[PDB]
Amino acid sequence: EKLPAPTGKPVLTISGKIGNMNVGDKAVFDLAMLEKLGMKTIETTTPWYTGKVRFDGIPLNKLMDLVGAKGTSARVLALNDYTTIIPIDDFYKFPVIMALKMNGQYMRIRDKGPLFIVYPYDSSAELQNQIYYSRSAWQVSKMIIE
């Protein structure tokens, strides 16, 4: 089905090698649109917090299927200047999510919110390294499929 236009203010903008766009050559999502997609939880320890933290968000695998991603990598840009490149295969290899809530509460824009890419770190020794930590971009605003 076609992808609708955002009614609310945009929180995420996907562009690049995508097949489904709603605003020009881009897939723009308001918070409401993101929540229409199924949610998944990740309960894991992290190098940013003490103990386990509960992350609720949308799996990036279904997010890629929704925009019809046809690239190999994803250039993730933070609200300011942070940049990270994630191989799309990570989304199919791992149940990575785009977190919206942390401990059942929306993330504050001042902290990691509104969007935060999280991997299930404690689920695999392989995920316990800087590679995956560096790709866990917070305050996400744009995604470019390359």
Ligand SMILES: Nc1nc2ncc([C@H](O)[C@H](O)CO)nc2c(=O)[nH]1
């Ligand atoms: N927005 C944003 N997200 C980030 N996600 C992960 C990491 C890494 O843990 C390291 O700090 C840098 O690779 N740094 C950042 C960062 O600076 N900014």
Ligand SMILES: [Cl-]
């Ligand atoms: Cl809004």
Ligand SMILES: [Cl-]
């Ligand atoms: Cl909204």
Ligand SMILES: [Cl-]
């Ligand atoms: Cl769904």
Ligand SMILES: [Cl-]
């Ligand atoms: Cl390609």
Ligand SMILES: [Cl-]
């Ligand atoms: Cl292992």
